[PDB]
């Protein structure tokens, strides 16, 4: 189980096919392999899963053009909303 | 050469595929094999040629349904118009 | 001597250098070689002479473009006027 | 034929009716608005 | 033919126009300068 | 951007013109057809 | 030459026009405002 | 021999006349003839002449008005005064004839009817009348001046 | 029923007449009809008769002059005195008619118009008039003596 | 102190008034003020009151009409006779006021103006007037009876 | 033989005179000659003399004023009274001549013109006139006293 | 053809009588 | 010949109507 | 968003002033 | 030189006539 989970983005680039660095953060128990997604409309991320067993935070990678868009990113079942400023490639 | 040529019909039947008896008549010189036709729209006759050498009149056979139609029938080059009453088969 | 003489044309073509079929007709006596001509302005015919001894009618050939023109054609000394409809070649 | 026989007589009865009604009423009105 | 068909109709429309215009205007003026 | 910058200022100059012309002419006519 | 021939005749026609117009109009006005 | 034609309000909007065997009134006068018998007759329109007529009952045929087509230039009379007839026209003074006067006869010095008034045309100085008359052969005629207003 | 026709200088050079439904004036009289309405009408020329006419407005049709083709030999009258009509000619004394008189009517003893003066021919002793008249059928006639001068 | 407003035909279709420092006329009266000076002034419309006004030249300001808002019930006067003022309305007899009367003042017994006539409403027995008045504070008022016809 | 010169407002601001074959008026008088013919003539300026002239139409040349250069000391007359001529000057009483009087002639006892008034100089006791005259040879002269105001 | 001309002749009665009625009612009113 | 006489007959309309107009306007003015 | 609200606020001036002019001219005529 | 003095003599006509006009109009007004 993962609790609270917060999303802190780092980079954003319009360029199609991935850029930017999303990094989720949480506290969890027992830990196993957690899945990842993006429930939003657009804004995807190349990474189906990440693993928590270490008892630490996670890191991820994503895509999307939008100058600044938000998207809901789940982590196993927990969720959150991400967003950030952007820049052209 | 054939001159004046007149057409005197005898029989007429709607039945498709020939009936009736057309008989042309004329006066000619030297005589040879004369062709036959029907310049009209419809109304045909099964007979491409007939011969005049005898110095007499000709006989022919034709087709057509029409209750009473006229058609121009040539004889070598001369021509005329034929027509007559009809009857069902 | 030839008497009455009538001209009955058959064909007419604009094409320069002969076409059409003029055919004179008459009754004559004793018969010999008869000359032929065209007293008119234009409209000629390639045939200087024709012979009557058979006691029959004559045939001839001519030229001329005109859509329909008349010309006087002599036969030995007799004469007449010819004319007819025309057609392009 | 029943289409040609009915259509002809359709404008035939109406021909001799409207044609004679207009020819008699107008002839009567012409003779009445003149004799008076 | 296109020279004979155009020239004939050239003085044909102008024939029934100038011919009828002079025949009607003069007939109207003759009937107007007479009825008045 | 040149489509958004021109369209905005298109109805901006026309906004403060027609908006102020109708607000001043009507305010003047309201003050003139009342003071008289 | 075409510059000297045009410039000379430019002030030549204008010389005998303005010169004679002022010499005749003033002579006429001098003879009219005196004879009257 | 003259009867009122009344509107639904009872007001007189015109007149009907017993003359030459029949009752007659101007067609444009839309109302009821003020008479028990004449109101029940079916009239025949003579539209080209703005008239409407019916045969007079036997009892009224006796003293019905007599009409005459002979009416030379001169002075005639009608209900409102002298009427002048000249140059083929019947004229009266301006401001004399109007609403309700349609149907009234123009009479001669012998008590005969010379014309029927349909309306008039105010010509500033005089009023020219629109009238129904008959010629020697008894043919109906309707004369209407320009500017005519059907009373 | 008679109106002045004025030149550009305002002088009277002829007359127009209201008669039989229309305004009429001699065509040779080139000027303006001294009237606010009649001056704005478009006239139709009747050149063979030296006349020009227009329909009278409704208000003037009332008392317009009446014309009569019946005018036997005798004495008539016009603005300047007696007029004699004999042998088909209207004559007046010499030195009586002149400039400006074209358009004036010749009247009979009943106030009807018998002719319209176009001008005259000084024949030493008497002056013969050029006149426009109409016959029984209403056909226009123009009679002109030799020596006629269009006033 | 009252001037004619003329149509193109010169006919009087209304009036202008010199009162309280200005020339004023009803706006619906479309014509020219019969005066060399006043016709050359540019008027300012007061549409809600069917009025149009201009400042009077210095020479006319002297004897211009004086207006008073104090006008109790009773009898007043205007060009055509007595005027009654009762229940807040100015009435005159029927068939007295009409075309051309718009612009005329209603006067009191001291020569002061009490109202300006714009038109009237024929109420069968009496004619109720549509008028322009002013209250104590000098505010314009326009009173119009139903059935009012702007003369 | 004297005509008004009007301003755009129709007021008389001076006069024009028919004399010796021509119409003449003071140039400083800027207006229209109140006459259908004379207003359509093109004038020739004689600026040194404050005059403007045009040839008189044939019909006016008849009774045009006659001018005389012979006018010894004594009393003359003009529209407003007696005029004294002494020491080469024409004087009138103070407060008698003014606006509109420019163009008026000074006449002698025989109906002849002796001078044309252009204006005057109020000299307290009398008013000295600025005038246009002609000498024996017909030469134009303009005499102007100090203090002259062109009326 | 005879059955199309005798049956087509009765339809010409409304184009024959109405014309012989309209050419007789317009000429008697205009003369 | 028929195409030169039917087409040559319409050109004779201005030499036919203008004459039937000029012979009708000169006779009515001279009588 | 700020460039679409400050630039979208000037276009609301014709929907702001014309309304503040139409709500001030219809109330002064009806009272 | 002759073409510059005969052509230069016509330009002296406006300096010759206008002077013979100005010296004749100023002397007749001052005397």
């Amino acid at each position: 189980l993962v609790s609270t989970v917060k999303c802190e983005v780092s980079e954003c680039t319009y360029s199609a096919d991935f850029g930017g660095m999303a990094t989720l953060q949480y506290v969890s128990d027992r830990e196993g392999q957690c899945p990842v997604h993006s429930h939003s409309s657009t804004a995807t991320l190349q990474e189906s899963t990440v693993h928590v067993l270490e008892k630490g935070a996670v890191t991820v990678h994503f895509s999307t053009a939008s100058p600044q868009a938000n998207f809901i990113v789940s982590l196993c079942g927990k969720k959150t909303t991400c967003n950030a400023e952007c820049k052209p490639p | 050469l054939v001159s004046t040529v007149k057409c005197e019909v005898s029989e007429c039947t709607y039945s498709a595929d020939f009936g009736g008896m057309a008989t042309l008549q004329y006066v000619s010189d030297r005589e040879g094999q004369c062709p036959v036709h029907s310049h009209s729209s419809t109304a045909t006759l099964q007979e491409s040629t007939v011969h005049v050498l005898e110095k007499g009149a000709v006989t022919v056979h034709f087709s057509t349904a029409s209750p009473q139609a006229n058609f121009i029938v040539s004889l070598c080059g001369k021509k005329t118009t034929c027509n007559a009453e009809c009857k069902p088969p | 001597l030839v008497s009455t003489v009538k001209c009955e044309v058959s064909e007419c073509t604009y094409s320069a250098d002969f076409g059409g079929m003029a055919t004179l007709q008459y009754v004559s006596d004793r018969e010999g070689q008869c000359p032929v001509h065209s007293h008119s302005s234009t409209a000629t015919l390639q045939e200087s002479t024709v012979h009557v001894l058979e006691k029959g009618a004559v045939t001839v050939h001519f030229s001329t473009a005109s859509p329909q023109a008349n010309f006087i054609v002599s036969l030995c000394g007799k004469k007449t006027t010819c004319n007819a409809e025309c057609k392009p070649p | 034929h029943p289409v040609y026989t009915i259509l002809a007589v359709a404008s035939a009865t109406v021909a001799m009716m409207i044609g004679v009604t207009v020819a008699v009423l107008c002839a009567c009105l012409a003779r009445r608005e003149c004799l008076t | 033919h296109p020279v004979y068909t155009i020239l004939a109709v050239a003085s044909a429309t102008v024939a029934m126009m100038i011919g009828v215009t002079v025949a009607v205007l003069c007939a109207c003026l003759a009937r107007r300068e007479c009825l008045t | 951007h040149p489509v958004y910058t021109i369209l905005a200022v298109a109805s901006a100059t026309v906004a403060m013109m027609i908006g102020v012309t109708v607000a001043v002419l009507c305010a003047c006519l309201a003050r003139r057809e009342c003071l008289t | 030459h075409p510059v000297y021939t045009i410039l000379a005749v430019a002030s030549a026609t204008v010389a005998m026009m303005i010169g004679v117009t002022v010499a005749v109009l003033c002579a006429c006005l001098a003879r009219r405002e005196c004879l009257t | 021999r003259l009867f009122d034609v009344k509107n639904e309000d009872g007001d007189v909007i015109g007149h009907a006349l017993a003359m030459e065997g029949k009752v007659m009134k101007p067609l444009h006068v839309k109302g009821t003839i003020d008479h028990p018998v004449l109101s029940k007759l079916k009239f025949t329109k003579s539209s080209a002449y703005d008239m409407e007529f019916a045969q007079l009952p036997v009892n009224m045929r006796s003293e019905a008005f007599t009409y005459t087509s002979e009416h030379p230039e001169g002075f005639y009379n009608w209900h409102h005064g002298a009427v002048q007839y000249s140059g083929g026209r019947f004229t009266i003074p301006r401001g004399v004839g109007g609403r309700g006067d349609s149907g009234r006869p123009i009479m001669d010095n012998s008590g005969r009817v010379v014309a029927i008034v349909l309306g008039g045309a105010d010509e500033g100085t005089r009023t020219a009348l629109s009238v129904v008359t008959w010629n020697s052969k008894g043919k109906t005629i309707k004369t209407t001046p320009e500017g005519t207003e059907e009373w | 029923r008679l109106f002045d026709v004025k030149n550009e200088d305002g002088d009277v050079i002829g007359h127009a007449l209201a008669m039989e439904g229309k305004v009429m004036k001699p065509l040779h009289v080139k000027g303006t009809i001294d009237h606010p309405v009649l001056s704005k009408l478009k006239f139709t020329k009747s050149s063979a008769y030296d006349m020009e006419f227009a329909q009278l407005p409704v208000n003037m049709r009332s008392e317009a002059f009446t014309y009569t083709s019946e005018h036997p030999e005798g004495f008539y009258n016009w603005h300047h005195g007696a007029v004699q009509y004999s042998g088909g000619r209207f004559t007046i004394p010499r030195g009586v008619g002149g400039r400006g008189d074209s358009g004036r009517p010749i009247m009979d003893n009943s106030g009807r118009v018998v002719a319209i003066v176009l001008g005259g021919a000084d024949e030493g002793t008497r002056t013969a008039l050029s006149v426009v008249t109409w016959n029984s059928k209403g056909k226009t006639i123009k009679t002109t003596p030799e020596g006629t001068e269009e006033w | 102190r009252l001037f004619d407003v003329k149509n193109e035909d010169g006919d009087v279709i209304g009036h202008a008034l010199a009162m309280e420092g200005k020339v004023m006329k009803p706006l619906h009266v479309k014509g020219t003020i019969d005066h060399p000076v006043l016709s050359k002034l540019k008027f300012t419309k007061s549409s809600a009151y069917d009025m149009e006004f201009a400042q009077l030249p210095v020479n006319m300001r002297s004897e211009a009409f004086t207006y008073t808002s104090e006008h109790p019930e009773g009898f007043y006067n205007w060009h055509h006779g007595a005027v009654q003022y009762s229940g807040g309305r100015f009435t005159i007899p029927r068939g007295v006021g009409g075309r051309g009367d718009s612009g005329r003042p209603i006067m009191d017994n001291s020569g002061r103006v009490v109202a300006i006539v714009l038109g009237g409403a024929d109420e069968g027995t009496r004619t109720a007037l549509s008028v322009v008045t002013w209250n104590s504070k000098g505010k314009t008022i326009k009173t119009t009876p139903e059935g009012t016809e702007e003369w | 033989r004297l005509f008004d010169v009007k301003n755009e407002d129709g007021d008389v601001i001076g006069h024009a005179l028919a004399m010796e074959g021509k119409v003449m008026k003071p140039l400083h008088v800027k207006g229209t000659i109140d006459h259908p013919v004379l207003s359509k003539l093109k004038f020739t300026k004689s600026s040194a003399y404050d005059m403007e002239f045009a040839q008189l139409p044939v019909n006016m040349r008849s009774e045009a004023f006659t001018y005389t250069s012979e006018h010894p000391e004594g009393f003359y007359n003009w529209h407003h009274g007696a005029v004294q001529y002494s020491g080469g000057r024409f004087t009138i009483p103070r407060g008698v001549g003014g606006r509109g009087d420019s163009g008026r002639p000074i006449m002698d006892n025989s109906g002849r013109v002796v001078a044309i008034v252009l204006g005057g100089a109020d000299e307290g006791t009398r008013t000295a006139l600025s005038v246009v005259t002609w000498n024996s040879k017909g030469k134009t002269i303009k005499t102007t006293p100090e203090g002259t105001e062109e009326w | 053809w005879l059955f199309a001309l005798f049956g087509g002749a009765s339809s010409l009665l409304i184009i024959g009588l109405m014309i012989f009625a309209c050419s007789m009612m317009l000429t008697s009113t205009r003369r | 010949w028929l195409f030169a006489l039917f087409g040559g007959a319409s050109s004779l309309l201005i030499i036919g109507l203008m004459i039937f107009a000029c012979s009708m306007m000169l006779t009515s003015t001279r009588r | 968003w700020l460039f679409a609200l400050f630039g979208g606020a000037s276009s609301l001036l014709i929907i702001g002033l014309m309304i503040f002019a139409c709500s001030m001219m219809l109330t002064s005529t009806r009272r | 030189w002759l073409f510059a003095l005969f052509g230069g003599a016509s330009s002296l006509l406006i300096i010759g006539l206008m002077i013979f006009a100005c010296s004749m109009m100023l002397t007749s007004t001052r005397r």
Binding site: - | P35, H37, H39, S48, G77 | - | - | - | - | - | - | - | - | - | - | - | - | -
Partner: protein, 290 residues
């Protein structure tokens, strides 16, 4: 050329055209079609017949684990069972109670009889028309087969002839048709690999020969009941035999426009449909006897 004509598509009907032009004595060209033939271009999609089930011997193994591997075979099925034959009495004569596994498997092979009789699923494509046409004029009693399309030319008596596109495009054959020797059936067979159980096309092979076969019989392995080692299965009857019953509308029966139907080239004979726009280019020579 340059004469143009049209003639109805009807067999045995003598046609006459009268061409008369210019100075030349008129000419009579008579041509009547001997027999049409609408042959659709077809492509054998596949073949079907009844199948034969092949079931290998079971592989029993006491106290050991079997595991079948995938196999290329058609409708290949296999399943390892467990707890199969409990004890020696179990039927296996095995020791362990349930540790025993049995490999079962089976597949479908085209029946033997198939090459003899079968059916073909074909694809009727934009058909073309033949023609027996016999042209004549003057002397040319000769007949000549030709294609009735806008293109194909053909010369007879020195005259070019083109019997243009048939006035219409109608055929008795649909997009998919099937032939069971001698009878053609318009039909909508399943696609290759599409095959459905217990129905036409349950097994399909591109050719009668083709080593490859696709089959979907719904062959299902069953669990053995302890008693005697065997391998039972459930399957759906041949789709082919079933089809034999629901063959249905044969084209041979329906006559439209007189069309006749023959299976060997698979065509429709002498249908009477549309007109054939004849077009010729005759020489002045043809006009012979001018």
């Amino acid at each position: 050329y340059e004469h143009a004509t049209t003639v109805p598509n009807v067999p045995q009907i003598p046609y006459k055209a009268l061409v008369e032009r210019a100075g030349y004595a008129p000419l009579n060209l008579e041509i009547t079609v001997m027999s049409s033939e609408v042959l659709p271009s077809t492509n054998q999609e596949y073949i079907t017949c009844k199948f034969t089930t092949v079931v290998p011997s079971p592989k029993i193994k006491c106290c050991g684990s079997l595991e079948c591997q995938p196999a290329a075979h058609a409708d290949y099925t296999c399943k390892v069972f467990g707890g199969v034959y409990p004890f020696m009495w179990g039927g296996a004569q095995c020791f362990c109670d349930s540790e025993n596994s049995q490999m079962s498997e089976a597949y479908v092979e085209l029946s033997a009889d198939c090459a003899s009789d079968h059916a073909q699923a074909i694809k009727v494509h934009t058909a073309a028309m033949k023609v027996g046409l016999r042209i004549v004029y003057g002397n040319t009693t000769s007949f000549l087969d030709v294609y009735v399309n806008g293109v194909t030319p053909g010369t007879s008596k020195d005259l070019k002839v083109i019997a243009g596109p048939i006035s219409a495009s109608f055929t008795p054959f649909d997009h998919k048709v099937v032939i069971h020797r001698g009878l053609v059936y318009n039909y909508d067979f399943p696609e290759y690999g599409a095959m459905k159980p217990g129905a036409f096309g349950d097994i399909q092979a591109t050719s009668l020969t083709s080593k490859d076969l696709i089959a979907s019989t719904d062959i299902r392995l069953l669990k053995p009941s302890a008693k005697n080692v065997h391998v039972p299965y459930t399957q759906a009857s041949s789709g082919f035999e079933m089809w034999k019953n629901n063959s249905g509308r044969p084209l041979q029966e329906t006559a439209p426009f007189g069309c006749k139907i023959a299976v060997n080239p698979l065509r429709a004979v002498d249908c009477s449909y549309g007109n054939i726009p004849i077009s010729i280019d005759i020489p002045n020579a043809a006009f012979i006897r001018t």
